[PDB]
Design an enzyme around this catalytic site. Structure first.
Site, PDB file in Angstrom:
ATOM      1  N   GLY A   7     -15.032  -0.638   1.994  1.00  0.00           N
ATOM      2  CA  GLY A   7     -13.998  -1.347   1.287  1.00  0.00           C
ATOM      3  C   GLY A   7     -13.246  -2.292   2.194  1.00  0.00           C
ATOM      4  O   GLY A   7     -13.023  -2.009   3.375  1.00  0.00           O
ATOM      5  N   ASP A  39      -6.078   3.340   5.232  1.00  0.00           N
ATOM      6  CA  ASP A  39      -5.407   4.612   5.039  1.00  0.00           C
ATOM      7  C   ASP A  39      -4.702   5.111   6.294  1.00  0.00           C
ATOM      8  O   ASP A  39      -4.016   6.138   6.231  1.00  0.00           O
ATOM      9  CB  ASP A  39      -6.421   5.679   4.615  1.00  0.00           C
ATOM     10  N   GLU A  63      -2.332   9.862  -4.055  1.00  0.00           N
ATOM     11  CA  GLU A  63      -3.444  10.309  -4.885  1.00  0.00           C
ATOM     12  C   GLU A  63      -4.151  11.516  -4.277  1.00  0.00           C
ATOM     13  O   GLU A  63      -4.885  12.215  -4.980  1.00  0.00           O
ATOM     14  CB  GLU A  63      -4.456   9.177  -5.104  1.00  0.00           C
ATOM     15  N   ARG A  92      -5.835  -4.448  -0.997  1.00  0.00           N
ATOM     16  CA  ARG A  92      -6.944  -4.449  -0.050  1.00  0.00           C
ATOM     17  C   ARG A  92      -7.237  -5.826   0.519  1.00  0.00           C
ATOM     18  O   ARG A  92      -7.658  -5.926   1.678  1.00  0.00           O
ATOM     19  CB  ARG A  92      -8.186  -3.876  -0.721  1.00  0.00           C
TER      20      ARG A  92
END
Ligand SMILES: Nc1ncnc2c1ncn2[C@@H]1O[C@H](COP(=O)(O)O)[C@@H](O)[C@H]1O
Ligand SMILES: Nc1ncnc2c1ncn2[C@@H]1O[C@H](COP(=O)(O)O)[C@@H](O)[C@H]1O
Ligand SMILES: Nc1ncnc2c1ncn2[C@@H]1O[C@H](COP(=O)(O)O)[C@@H](O)[C@H]1O
Ligand SMILES: Nc1ncnc2c1ncn2[C@@H]1O[C@H](COP(=O)(O)O)[C@@H](O)[C@H]1O
Ligand SMILES: O=P(O)(O)OC[C@H]1O[C@H](O)[C@H](O)[C@@H](O)[C@@H]1O
Ligand SMILES: O=P(O)(O)OC[C@H]1O[C@H](O)[C@H](O)[C@@H](O)[C@@H]1O
Ligand SMILES: [Cl-]
Ligand SMILES: [Mg+2]
EC number: 2.7.1.90
Lengths: 417, 423, 423, 422
Positions: free
Chosen positions: C12, C139, C244, C308
């Site tokens: 990603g 992250d 999450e 992102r």
């Protein structure tokens, strides 16, 4: 397939890439071949086809598919101008014929459009059709009132955001900022930034009654606002000044502007309007605890990424240029009026006295201008007649009410009320 | 004693509320008026208890409003409380306004807020109180002259463009399709504005569907054709913007499928709960069954509440300053039961009844004009199968192959969509 | 001929990928190297067809990369195509790298991308090819020295703060609670960063739960206590941020309630599909049942994909320039099978073995240190019921009254939460 | 309840409100009374307690609950400085005791911290506790290496975005911008903006070997960069200049800077460097020398628009932790200390540890031009290094771009390798 050539002239404005992509993407769907000339007329003026080819690029789908997000222009720009010489005009004609340019789109100011029409008139109408899209960040095209030119919305909004930081800084660390909004053509950009940001004062050339401005009147107009704010306990603020004040100043005023020196000549770009006013106002008001700092808001606006209004605006302009070519139009301007993109023949917009497209200035008689003036800090005709108010303001400046009236009351005949 | 101007906000927030409050308050203070603000709209005025109302009103001074023109939200908060339904509530609002000696009453809100202001006024003497309301909506669905926006719309559209820009870069960097759902069921102005500005590959709004009721299958197939055409040109990614108003145009059968082949939820009084619908998520699930095997991944994304209290852009800052001034101008000029609107660069009051649609009794709703030049231009830059595209067999063969189906199968499935939406 | 440097991105996107590509490319071009970029990671190198690879490789020239350091995303795209699973694919990659004469091979991606590069390298001679990978994660879960960020994290946290700021203004303007769900299940750095910066009233990350498995009821009650305490102080609105990752710590029973008292969705291989979970929505529906009578409305909001590919902030632009330079420096000094990381202000290569967690075979995951002073400071500014708060009879009386229940009922229901989360 | 008094000193930086809100909210949870002095030391220096009282406000929860989003400072700031006179120092002590301030927090740069300690040494550490928080967009406080002062990240990031617009404009309409980055103390801010934005050149005082800079050397350092880009087909760029070059210039250089005039001076005889226009003067000279080559040059200042920008998330988290650490230092009996953050831990550091022994004032942290970070930033700049001047082919190409012989170019520019670190 027919060949469409695109170039940019003049100074960039937010949304140039929007026009290039709107015209190019639509033309590619029609099967046209699209090329772009780098730096406007700069290399077309040489007439050397090898030099031009080294500075033209193929405008493909991949190149233009995502430039509508981006400020500036991917094919660059220049102020190179073939209209001055017939030899240069024929050099442009020679290169366009060599490249088989059927459709010729120029995105630029009046100078860029004038070069386009000059090249076309000497050319056969069947081989080449020429359209120009008028570009200006100054909002000075003769569109219906309150209708903006593309790029103006982006420049005004980023200008508001810069002035917002200066409003917070002037209050946090008390001082006055004299912001000079670049652009000598009109007062649209300065007044737009000032009104949006709640600036305490805005001075544009359009509000001066006499044909020539005096340096002393500008200093005193700022001085009155500073004293009135000081009379209400506030020794800080922001005052926005259109650079167009300089081009309306008399010869004597320009002499004082450049430091009581002889003005340079070949030159208004070397003038420092905000700084000169800062030095004089510090002499008169520094003893009161007032500090003054100049700040120009210019070139950082020209290539900001377009805001949504200009992204939509320029996409419709690019579509309208291709539409005009398809309908056989030439020597026309792609403009949007009342929500409709339409071609408009160049001379229909020209001012006969000038030979250039007419300049729309701020209408200081409109209600919008009066509303903007309401929220500014200033001394009106009625204010000078308010004896209590005049006493407090004069006291803030440590002078008698009679001295204050003697110096400042005449300004009601200098600027519209 | 100086006259009292009272201000409240009703409805959902839009960028520029503080601009209207600061424009009206600053000018009124220059006129010597005393300005107060009611917290949370009609919420406490409906009680009728003057002590409760005073506990939730504040004095709007120069220091409070001098720099709120930069800020989103509303410093006096807002509510959807509506006294128009009951005459007891209407008289409670009159009782509190008289108690606070409000001479001028300005409401900033949608149609329900304006109607409540007018109902309170009709029972009041025109000499004691004058009532003006400023129409606010981020949905741009007020009946202003065409192409002229309501305040807050420019801010919502510009921030919406910036968010979609990130999703456009992300969709291309890591090939995927985003189904962006633009919040708002009233009209398609906001969805189409964001899509056109951001160069999104598709936009679906309720206004472009010819039939009175939309079918869930038709929405799925309109996106599916766009995805396949892009895939026929080597691009397995994109962004499609969906007006949430598609849901409110859907048939009963379509809503059943939308809620998961479930019974649509209902409130205590029987209204279907469309807020619980998730249009972008449901369409993504269906399209993944059909297109996941082709290498297509699809993700939903909502663009809603983050727009409502964004700081106003310069266009709205000027707009709301002129509106706040126009409210004070209307009070001074003796107007009442009027709405302050800006038309052709001029702010003027317009009587509420003059704006009503006689067939409905409510203010007419301006939707996207899909016959306009603007909508056709937006549609040109979208990726889609037009009428002529379905007749181009070379194109249909490339698209069908991209979808791993025969050209005849492709025509059978998708060709009927030309009768679903205006072309 | 000049040495050939080949660059690809996997995984990603994160803000600053283009900064690394430009840092490596600009320095290499000054060294006279030829630089190429593979589109979509290993996707086309896996085919083994050299004609296909060349059609999806581009020459990274000075003109291409001179100004991409301003831009989010990656101009050479990315994919999660992963050759490590098969040597038929790995040897396809080896065949294409040799054909293109790649001397230096730089991959920018997660653990799958780094491992794929080393697996391809192990089958090749160390003289012909040198392989370096730059570890990427938005992250912030790389095992760097504590408080030192991975590239892309600063940008994501700052844009997240700006979104929550609009939701904080909106929650106060029109009273409501937003449950913001920060997407990303690896760790709580991103959720806690956005919440602390924006002054959100509560943040819940999996790292603060003492037990190995979380219960759905406990999450509901932790939010419920915060809403009630805020309600006891006259504030019926707020913002709560939820990592999450809470979903990935939930027990089997908790997941059953999360998915609607249904069996959790599953893929073809039988593994649970946590992406279909809607944590913020489920908590909102439950909290509305419990608190709707108090005048509380609750709305979910996801903050995911729009982060992102945001343009990098200055910290990440400088960071990725130094990483790109450090990769070329590592190639020049003969390093291979190494990871370019920045630690204590120095960009250095770090051998794979130093960072791998033996239990997982993947790079060690740095989680939020809930014993650190930074976490304690963040918790101080949250609204919450501490151990000491439950022992305060005056406070418990007010909160219980806000919830329309007796102090005994409140203590009996909520006091156990002090053993659920670290204090 | 104990009284906490808070003031801001110096020029504003983003996150001042973050420190005020972090300190005030926590102190309110402890039951303390919090007050804020408007405009720093301006009124405390008068000694008139009546005037000070008119310029203090009560810092309540409602005032500070959401100012962590806001740039600037709600209690304003000033450069009023009690350090200069013992008469003033006692005026500040007199007013603080009158208001019964037990805990005294000053938020400012090196000048503000030094002023706080001057007040501190004559006061009892038990009677009054004085703590200061590091504020500067110039990043020039002596914090642990690689740790920034608050406001620097916000200033650097907005500076990058402004320069990005100038980068797009210089390429779209070829020209060179000379950006003058405000701040004469150090080169952290100029170098940070330039590196993040990929500017083609950055000049900071820290890289000049000699103690005094010459105006000709500055002109020629830019000129070589412009010519080299011109040798590669690029007649445009952006160059970032630390305003601190002005404060390193010799007497002769300052004479040329102000137009071959005598530099302006204050009543005490010190030069008024605020009136200097470094970027404008360099632009005029370079247009004379290079205008014929197709070069246009425009100066641009990036200053005051950075100081009160809303804080970025790094500064929001930073200043939240700094405000908390200030209250924690008060609770633990610390005084005459600075709240600093190192390895994720906020701790007080006694003021004396930070003083420069030769100066008696807070030590100023400059750019370390020997560090790896500076070398990496320099690699991506356009410039002539020693090895470049020794490359005969390169020198011929650049000299031709400047329309001069290789010998003329070497004579003029090669000495610059002894002017600036390589
Ligand atoms: N020139 C001005 N522009 C904008 N506001 C003003 C101006 N002069 C005064 N005010 C404000 O308008 C109000 C006038 O009330 P007063 O001066 O008390 O009669 C006060 O709130 C002033 O701060
Ligand atoms: N529906 C569409 N919207 C916008 N561009 C398109 C569309 N369909 C094709 N194009 C592009 O238009 C050009 C003409 O395509 P072709 O059909 O190959 O002549 C190519 O650049 C296509 O990618
Ligand atoms: N959990 C909490 N987090 C942050 N602030 C709080 C919390 N609880 C109370 N406060 C505030 O702390 C201050 C002192 O509270 P009290 O001790 O109840 O007077 C007031 O401003 C409260 O609103
Ligand atoms: N001083 C410099 N700083 C950064 N890049 C440069 C510099 N000089 C040349 N370049 C670029 O680095 C590469 C080296 O060119 P050359 O060494 O002349 O083949 C080319 O892409 C140049 O455009
Ligand atoms: O996604 P890409 O193929 O790069 O192109 C993106 C395209 O999206 C839209 O559908 C518009 O037609 C074009 O204005 C835009 O270029
Ligand atoms: O101005 P351009 O030649 O397009 O490139 C701009 C270049 O400026 C800087 O000096 C750096 O060397 C590069 O990181 C950057 O690409
Ligand atoms: Cl003197
Ligand atoms: Mg200092």
């Amino acid at each position: 397939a027919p060949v469409l050539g695109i170039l940019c002239g003049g100074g960039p404005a937010p949304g140039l890439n929007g026009v290039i992509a709107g015209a190019t993407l639509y033309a590619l769907r029609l099967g046209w071949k699209v090329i772009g000339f780098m730096e406007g007329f700069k290399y077309l003026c040489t007439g050397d086809v090898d030099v031009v080819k080294a500075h033209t690029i193929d405008l493909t789908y991949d190149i233009v598919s995502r430039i509508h997000f981006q400020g500036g222009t991917i094919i660059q720009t220049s102020r190179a101008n073939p209209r001055k010489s017939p030899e240069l005009q024929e050099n442009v004609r020679k290169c366009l014929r060599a490249l088989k340019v059927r459709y010729f789109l120029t995105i630029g100011g009046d100078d860029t459009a004038s070069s386009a029409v000059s090249v076309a008139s000497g050319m056969n109408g069947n081989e080449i059709s020429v359209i120009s899209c008028p570009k200006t960040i100054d909002n000075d095209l003769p569109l219906p009132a309150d209708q903006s030119t593309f790029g103006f919305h982006t420049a005004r909004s980023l200008g508001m955001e810069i002035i917002r930081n200066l409003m917070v800084d002037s209050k946090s660390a008390p001082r006055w900022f004299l912001v000079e909004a670049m652009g000598r053509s009109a007062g649209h950009l300065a007044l737009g930034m000032a009104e949006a940001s709640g600036a305490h004062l805005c001075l544009i050339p359009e509000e001066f009654k006499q044909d020539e401005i005096e340096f002393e009147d500008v200093v005193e107009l700022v001085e009155a606002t500073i004293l009135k704010r000081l009379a209400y306990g506030k020794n800080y603020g922001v005052c926005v000044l259109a650079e167009g004040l300089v081009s309306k100043m008399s010869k004597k005023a320009l002499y004082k502007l450049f430091g009581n020196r002889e003005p340079p000549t070949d030159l208004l770009d070397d003038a420092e309007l905000a700084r000169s006013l800062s030095e004089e106002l510090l002499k008169r008001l520094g003893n009161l605890g007032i500090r003054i700092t100049p700040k120009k808001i210019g070139y950082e606006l020209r290539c900001a990424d377009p805001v949504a209004f200009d992204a939509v605006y320029t996409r419709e302009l690019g579509y309208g240029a291709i539409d005009a070519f398809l309908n056989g139009h030439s020597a026309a301007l792609i403009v949007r009026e009342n929500g409709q993109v339409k071609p408009v023949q160049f001379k229909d917009l020209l001012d006969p006295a000038t030979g250039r497209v007419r300049t729309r200035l701020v209408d200081v008689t409109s209600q919008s201008f009066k509303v903007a003036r309401v929220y500014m800090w200033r001394m009106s005709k009625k204010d000078y007649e308010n004896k209590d108010l005049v006493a407090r303001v004069a006291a803030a400046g440590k002078m008698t009410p009679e001295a204050f009236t003697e110096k400042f009351a005449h300004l009601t005949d200098v600027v519209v009320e």
